[PDB]
Amino acid sequence: AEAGITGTWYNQLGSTFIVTAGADGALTGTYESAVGNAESRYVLTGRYDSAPATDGSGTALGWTVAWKNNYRNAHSATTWSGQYVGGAEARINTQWLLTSGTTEANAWKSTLVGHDTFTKVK
Amino acid sequence: AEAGITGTWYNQLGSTFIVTAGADGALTGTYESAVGNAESRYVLTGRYDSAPATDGSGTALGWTVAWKNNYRNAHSATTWSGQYVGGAEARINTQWLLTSGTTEANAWKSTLVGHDTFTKVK
Amino acid sequence: AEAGITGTWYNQLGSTFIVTAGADGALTGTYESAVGNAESRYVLTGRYDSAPATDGSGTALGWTVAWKNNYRNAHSATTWSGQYVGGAEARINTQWLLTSGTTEANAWKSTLVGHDTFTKVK
Amino acid sequence: AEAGITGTWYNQLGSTFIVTAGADGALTGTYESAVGNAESRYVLTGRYDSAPATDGSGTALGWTVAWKNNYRNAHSATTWSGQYVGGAEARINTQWLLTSGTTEANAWKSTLVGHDTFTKVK
Numbered sequence: 001a002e003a004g005i006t007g008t009w010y011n012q013l014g015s016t017f018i019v020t021a022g023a024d025g026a027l028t029g030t031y032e033s034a035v036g037n038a039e040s041r042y043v044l045t046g047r048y049d050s051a052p053a054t055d056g057s058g059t060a061l062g063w064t065v066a067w068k069n070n071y072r073n074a075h076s077a078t079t080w081s082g083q084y085v086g087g088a089e090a091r092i093n094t095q096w097l098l099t100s101g102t103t104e105a106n107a108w109k110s111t112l113v114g115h116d117t118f119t120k121v122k
Numbered sequence: 123a124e125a126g127i128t129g130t131w132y133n134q135l136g137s138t139f140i141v142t143a144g145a146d147g148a149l150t151g152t153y154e155s156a157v158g159n160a161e162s163r164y165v166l167t168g169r170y171d172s173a174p175a176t177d178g179s180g181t182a183l184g185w186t187v188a189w190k191n192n193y194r195n196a197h198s199a200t201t202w203s204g205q206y207v208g209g210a211e212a213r214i215n216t217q218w219l220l221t222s223g224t225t226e227a228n229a230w231k232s233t234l235v236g237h238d239t240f241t242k243v244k
Numbered sequence: 245a246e247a248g249i250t251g252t253w254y255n256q257l258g259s260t261f262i263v264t265a266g267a268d269g270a271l272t273g274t275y276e277s278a279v280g281n282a283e284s285r286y287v288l289t290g291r292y293d294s295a296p297a298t299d300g301s302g303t304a305l306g307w308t309v310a311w312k313n314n315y316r317n318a319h320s321a322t323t324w325s326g327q328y329v330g331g332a333e334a335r336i337n338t339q340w341l342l343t344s345g346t347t348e349a350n351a352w353k354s355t356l357v358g359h360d361t362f363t364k365v366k
Numbered sequence: 367a368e369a370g371i372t373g374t375w376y377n378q379l380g381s382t383f384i385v386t387a388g389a390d391g392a393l394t395g396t397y398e399s400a401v402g403n404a405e406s407r408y409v410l411t412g413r414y415d416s417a418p419a420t421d422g423s424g425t426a427l428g429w430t431v432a433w434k435n436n437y438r439n440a441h442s443a444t445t446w447s448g449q450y451v452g453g454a455e456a457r458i459n460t461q462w463l464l465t466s467g468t469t470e471a472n473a474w475k476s477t478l479v480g481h482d483t484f485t486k487v488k
């Protein structure tokens with residue numbers, strides 16, 4: 001939790017996310033996707049468990065990125081749900097949902113699901 | 123987008139979420155779950171597309187809730203990814219990921235997936 | 245389980261699925277999608293719990309459809325995971341994963357997730 | 367497709383799956399889980415695209431396992447949706463949904479989601 005999360009993280013696609021974990025469970029930062037209809041940095045906000053279990057369990061967390069910034073607007077938003085595992089080789093393992101705004105007829109195909117693993121080393 | 127999202131919403135489980143959508147894509151509010159290891163209100167933060175398509179597409183959005191408040195700490199976080207559809211009968215259709223902090227051995231079973239539909243009427 | 249599952253079911257998109265649940269947990273039948281790159285009937289195969297709990301729990305089941313038949317080949321496959329709830333108003337509630345064959349570069353966006361509810365009445 | 371899929375595969379949890387891919391898109395075999403409420407082998411059935419794209423795209427496939435055999439009955443079923451990528455280092459990348467039979471009140475938490483990567487080497 002807290003201290004260990006703040007920083008720059010890289011995932012397997014080459015995306016970068018910089019976050020600051022605040023004392024009372026808030027996560028704020030920017031995300032830069034190495035793939036998709038995206039360019040530059042996007043604002044992200046989220047929450048994490050600031051009083052995790054004192055056993056070897058991970059710290060649960062999640063964040064959202066709406067893919068609109070001053071350069072592009074992909075009319076979609078991605079939410080990452082996962083846990084932070086600290087130690088020598090810290091990582092954040094997540095599963096994500098990317099929903100695009102669609103008309104009612106295409107709603108059935110509006111959401112993509114995947115998984116990303118973030119490390120402090122890339 | 124914006125104006126239409128702010129308010130109190132209810133989903134099919136009986137949970138309540140009150141949010142304020144700010145001018146530049148931010149969502150802030152509280153969530154009260156009618157089920158699970160939860161009690162009272164939890165803080166939520168998210169993002170939405172503040173410049174959605176002008177055709178009949180929904181507005182993409184997402185938010186996160188870390189299930190820790192002054193009464194309980196379920197060491198888990200839920201992220202809702204979906205879209206807002208306005209009109210006579212406005213609704214927010216979503217899919218969610220609920221991840222619990224686990225030890226590495228139980229990580230494979232750390233995440234639940236489901237779907238919630240929110241209406242302004244309950 | 246068994247007897248109660250065999251038949252024709254319809255979901256909210258208007259798709260039809262006809263299945264036969266065999267004595268030892270097998271499900272065989274055809275699926276006709278009302279949406280997507282599909283035409284006519286596709287072969288489906290799956291499994292279900294043929295000795296479900298005797299309390300009011302649902303019967304877990306799942307099936308797969310590869311979207312290739314004599315008319316079309318969408319190079320994708322959908323798997324539905326859910327449970328059968330019997331009674332006056334029987335239904336099968338499911339969540340599904342639709343994966344398309346992609347090149348390694350586009351693998352991150354290869355899978356769609358959604359949910360379908362099947363009834364014996366349409 | 368076809369020839370390349372038949373065989374024994376191992377995933378990162380240490381589970382084993384042996385399948386035979388038949389000429390017209392059928393997959394039959396057994397699965398042995400290294401984790402969960404499981405013991406020994408379970409029957410699996412599925413489908414795959416037997417006429418995949420001739421570019422470097424993966425072959426889409428999916429299969430289901432109902433966790434009931436002669437030793438145990440976990441009243442749950444798992445469906446794996448993914449694609450087969452052949453070559454020197456062949457693998458099947460998947461995302462899965464594990465649904466447990468529950469009472470209507472607990473249905474919201476009936477499904478787990480995860481991802482498994484299978485190799486011919488373990």
Ligand SMILES: O=C(O)CCCC[C@@H]1SC[C@@H]2NC(=O)N[C@@H]21
Nearest residue numbers: 015033036037038067074076078
């Ligand atoms: O195409 C879009 O809608 C915008 C870019 C989406 C990028 C995705 S979301 C999950 C995955 N992980 C990343 O770092 N990028 C992709």
Ligand SMILES: O=C(O)CCCC[C@@H]1SC[C@@H]2NC(=O)N[C@@H]21
Nearest residue numbers: 137155158159160189196198200
């Ligand atoms: O059990 C927990 O970890 C805390 C409560 C979780 C409640 C869930 S998250 C999705 C679903 N929708 C709701 O409104 N509540 C449940």
Ligand SMILES: O=C(O)CCCC[C@@H]1SC[C@@H]2NC(=O)N[C@@H]21
Nearest residue numbers: 259277280281282311318320322
């Ligand atoms: O587009 C394709 O790849 C083939 C058709 C896919 C139809 C989907 S799978 C889930 C959803 N439920 C249905 O009945 N049809 C759509």
Ligand SMILES: O=C(O)CCCC[C@@H]1SC[C@@H]2NC(=O)N[C@@H]21
Nearest residue numbers: 381399402403404433440442444
């Ligand atoms: O606990 C159960 O219901 C039976 C065992 C479930 C094992 C799961 S399903 C996905 C994951 N991959 C595996 O090989 N095993 C676990």
